[PDB]
Amino acid sequence: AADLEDNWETLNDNLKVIEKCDNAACVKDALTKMRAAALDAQKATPPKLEDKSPDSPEMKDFRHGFDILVGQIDDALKLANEGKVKEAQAAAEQLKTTRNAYIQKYL
């Protein structure tokens, strides 16, 4: 689905931005766009799960992954708002493990 692809690309491009950021505002802005992308992608049905039921275990698993991902973005956003550039970057790298094991397999 087009919207879902754009939100997923926004999530992954803005991860790259975070690692090469030099200040806190850079990190916070990237996390801002990841959060708004994750809020939309959270609601979508990935194409591999189009036929599934919305209460299927795969859709439950897809939605729980984005709950974790949104929780992780919020943790990193808390660190960026305190000025802790490096800790916010370390908290951003945590998203990669959730992305692979939970969400990427369904896209």
Author numbering: 0 to 106
Provide the publication's sentences verbatim.
Previous studies showed that proper introduction of disulfide bonds could stabilize the flexible region of target proteins and reduce the conformational entropy by locking the protein into single desired conformation. Here we developed a comprehensive disulfide bond prediction algorithm that not just increased the success rate of predictions but also improved the quality of crystallized target proteins. We applied our method on two proteins which were previously determined to high resolution and frequently used as fusion partners for GPCR crystallization, cytochrome b562 (BRIL) and Flavodoxin, and verified our prediction by solving the crystal structures of the wild type (WT) proteins and mutants. The theoretical and experimental results both indicated that with relatively lower values of conformational entropy, proteins would be more stable and readily crystallized to higher diffraction resolution.
